[PDB]
Design a protein around this ligand. Structure first.
Ligand SMILES: Cc1cc2nc3c(=O)[nH]c(=O)nc-3n(C[C@H](O)[C@H](O)[C@H](O)COP(=O)(O)OP(=O)(O)OC[C@H]3O[C@@H](n4cnc5c(N)ncnc54)[C@H](O)[C@@H]3O)c2cc1C
Ligand SMILES: Cc1cc2nc3c(=O)[nH]c(=O)nc-3n(C[C@H](O)[C@H](O)[C@H](O)COP(=O)(O)OP(=O)(O)OC[C@H]3O[C@@H](n4cnc5c(N)ncnc54)[C@H](O)[C@@H]3O)c2cc1C
Lengths: 336, 336
């Protein structure tokens, strides 16, 4: 059995690992390769703060809510483990702020200690009149990707830096299953008008007195088009940019200004915080995650798609990897 | 009017500043001088992490509940101003862990968003079965004392490094009011058998992924004789040593091991944190704060005592300071 995973973001690397844990014992030659054009630290995954939080509104596929909840339990189960530091994993609480009242999120019982904000809390934020407080987790993609890499290396998974041109090129080399975890670029392998860049930009800032995340929302502007402030391990992520169809992988001054002045107003102690770096990335936006089998091609090759995780790839990755690992088990039964 | 404030910890500096702000305009000569044996960073104020939290049991003097609330409201009014970083002041949420259910604390409505831990939060901590979550404040003594020093230097308040041997040595120099802010050492200037040292010890470690405080409680061993973990702006404080009557200003290896092993069992990710430093100080333990006036005979002289804040001098300093300034006004009234 020869398996080629395309993509070394969190989606491909976690899928690779999951497929290996569940089937190395029962497939005598289980040879897994990863083809990726970019590795950490140059993926979309490395740009994310890594806060666990799905979108506010229920997903078009209800099984995504389970995949997120399965990811949360796995990560929470390891947050006190000694190797949590190597994962870039830790607990964090904070605020979601709104101008108007709004229905409670579908994941209110996935997170810890969910509640509405008391009136004295909403006084610290003049421009906002309603919101939530809850405890979640941060999984910083860069530590995590490096962790996944070294786990798959000790399991025999080999890594190759190449741009794949077609599915059929990979099948020609003799792949049996192709796992397609190509993120926002999946359209180049197979046209998909439902997949779109959601361009984001973030600032990384030294502000270690900040112990809480703070996400604000403007419901007439789209999600993550309002300031947010997410403390990481070494640095504080400042953000609030979400632009559909924008493929420019290049930091933009206007967006820099939007992030800075938006966050500084939200939390004035930021004014003196030092800017450590700035980064742009492309959420793979789709109305739903594509996570499903497809049979292509010459004499036929199995493909497992797993892309389109928008702005919640880190939040939902483990449930997705588990599901793709299931789809892989079904391929093996069909192949006898 | 010549005022001599003895002591440059949090109590003496805040009281000096509080008195100058309220009376420099209506006292044409208001010469305030601070005398201190030790300044930052050699005071026990410097050793404290600075978490705002009273003892759990109701204070012997009910006016201390108000002094603590006034301090929290004051600090909370300044946490979102760019001044805040200079003070060393920021918001922080976290846990108080108990083995068994116990009564709520009196101060439960002073802090933000108080509530009980849910079962899934309690599961993160095997050794404890009950507790609280809430949002409080940290005021790190080191930055706060240097900020107080700067506000005071800007106001003509001159400082002198000297050991005061007696009250009337200071009166013989010409002091009209003496503000006694000598903390744990007050018994040397006037015997007070109710004032005793509560020796504590703490480690500072590098663990910047800890975003919550965690205080544990063992009602059999007494308050703060159980692991606590308090993230600061730059390092995390590990502690849990409260030894009545011990005057040894020296780090002890047994107490090191108790702190380290207790906090590592509480939070295993701490086992790879680098130890940055280690400090010992003396909580000025008294069954209630001595904040009151006394006429002492000389030649006589006016005295305001303000000492014996135990393990909550930062929690309560500002209410005490305002009270000491009222008492200063009553002195001005009697002399017309
Ligand atoms: C600014 C910003 C902030 C975010 N914050 C969060 C957050 O806080 N929490 C959260 O959960 N999510 C967040 N996200 C979303 C998250 O980053 C993404 O959903 C996630 O990284 C997508 O994972 P992925 O592996 O599919 O794609 P990415 O990591 O891009 O990985 C794609 C991989 O596919 C490879 N590839 C593509 N095409 C080919 C090819 N033809 N041949 C070979 N290799 C190919 C790429 O080189 C790369 O290796 C954020 C995103 C952005 C942009
Ligand atoms: C380990 C530990 C942790 C703590 N953590 C916290 C916490 O998290 N939150 C909290 O609220 N509280 C905490 N505390 C308690 C807090 O540190 C004390 O209550 C507070 O700092 C005492 O303030 P002070 O100004 O009275 O005395 P200290 O700062 O000592 O100041 C005393 C001053 O008086 C001077 N002085 C004394 N005698 C003379 C003299 N004869 N002549 C000249 N100068 C003299 C001393 O040199 C010094 O200048 C902690 C205490 C300890 C020990």
């Amino acid at each position: 059995m020869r398996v080629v995973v395309i993509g070394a973001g969190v989606i491909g690397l976690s899928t690779a690992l999951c497929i290996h844990e569940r089937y190395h014992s029962v497939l005598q030659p289980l040879d897994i390769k990863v083809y990726a054009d970019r590795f950490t630290p140059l993926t979309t995954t490395d740009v994310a703060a890594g806060l666990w939080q799905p979108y506010l509104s229920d997903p078009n596929n209800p099984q995504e809510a389970d995949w997120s909840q399965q990811t949360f339990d796995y990560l929470l189960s390891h947050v006190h483990s000694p190797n949590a530091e190597n994962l870039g994993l830790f607990l964090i609480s904070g605020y979601n702020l709104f101008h108007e009242a709004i229905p409670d999120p579908s994941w209110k019982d996935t997170v810890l200690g969910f509640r509405k904000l008391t009136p004295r809390e909403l006084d610290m934020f003049p421009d906002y009149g309603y919101g939530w407080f809850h405890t979640s987790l941060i999984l910083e993609g860069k530590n995590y990707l490096q962790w996944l890499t070294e786990r798959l290396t000790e399991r025999g998974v080999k890594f190759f830096q190449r741009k794949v041109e077609s599915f059929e090129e990979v099948a020609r080399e003799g792949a049996d299953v192709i796992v397609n975890c190509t993120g926002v670029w999946a359209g180049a392998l197979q046209r998909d008008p439902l997949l779109q860049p959601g361009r984001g930009q973030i600032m990384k800032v030294d502000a270690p007195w900040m112990k809480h995340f703070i996400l604000t929302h403007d419901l007439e502007r789209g999600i993550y088009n309002s300031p947010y402030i997410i403390p990481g391990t070494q640095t504080v992520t400042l953000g609030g940019i979400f632009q559909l169809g924008n493929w420019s992988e290049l930091n933009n001054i206007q967006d820099h200004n939007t992030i800075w002045e938006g966050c500084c107003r939200l939390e004035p102690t930021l004014k003196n915080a030092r800017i450590i770096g700035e980064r742009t990335g492309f959420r793979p936006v789709r109305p739903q995650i594509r996570l499903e089998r497809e049979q292509l091609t010459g004499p036929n090759t199995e493909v497992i798609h797993n892309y389109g995780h928008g702005g919640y790839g880190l939040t939902i990755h483990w449930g997705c990897a588990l599901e793709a690992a299931k789809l892989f088990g079904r391929i093996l039964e069909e192949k006898k």
